[PDB]
């Protein structure tokens, strides 16, 4: 086949439908502190600093912040091993990740829950519960008698 920086991009780098024109200003006012997760989505509208195609849609940790760019460490399988790769990228092509935000909420409630016992002797054992089997109750309402259907061609 043929290899180019943007080969097979077509659908992948397409702007979208009715989504043409430049980035909005409020998305350009997002801050990214180092030690923070970000999903690399590249918008073809800006051709400056767009990352390579493989990294598109990859979540990874911000290690640097250049003035007009964000150093993101992502990770990449090469047969036998993962290897952590360090890719700079323009500000428009980075989104804030939302993958961590349940865990970030969770710790504030969970650490405050363990805190507040003190002399009652904590040992709360705070933990999510996976919704397995339901217990039993009586249930009653209006009924219908169904039967199976004869075939019709139409």
């Amino acid at each position: 086949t043929s290899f180019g920086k943007r080969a097979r991009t077509r659908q992948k780098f397409s702007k979208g439908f009715r989504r043409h024109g430049m980035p909005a200003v409020s998305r350009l006012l997002v801050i990214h502190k180092k030690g923070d997760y970000v999903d690399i989505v590249c918008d073809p509208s800006v051709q400056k600093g767009m990352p390579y195609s493989y990294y598109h849609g990859r979540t990874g940790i911000v290690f640097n912040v250049t003035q007009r760019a964000v150093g993101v460490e992502v990770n990449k399988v090469v047969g036998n091993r993962v290897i952590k790769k360090r890719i700079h990228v323009r500000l428009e092509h980075v989104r804030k990740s939302r993958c961590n935000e349940l865990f970030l909420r969770r710790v504030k409630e969970n650490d405050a829950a363990h805190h507040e016992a003190h002399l009652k002797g904590e040992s709360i054992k705070t933990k999510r519960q996976i919704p397995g089997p339901k217990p039993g109750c009586f249930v009653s309402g209006t009924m219908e008698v169904l039967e199976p259907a004869p075939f019709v061609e139409s």
Binding site: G35, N64, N80, V82, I83
Partner: protein
């Protein structure tokens, strides 16, 4: 006398035989950070000695 051009067969099975993940480390490596920034981390560390 061809012969086969290419194949991905038995390559996933070979890789998974051993897919090592790099060990996590405290304190992030600074290779590829700003030179201006890393100048002031040296000047920082000097000032507390």
């Amino acid at each position: 006398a061809k012969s086969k051009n290419h194949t991905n067969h038995n390559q996933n099975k070979k890789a998974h035989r051993n897919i090592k993940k790099p060990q996590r480390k405290r304190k992030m490596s600074t290779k590829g950070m700003c030179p201006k920034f890393l100048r002031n981390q040296r000047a920082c560390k000097r000032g507390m000695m």
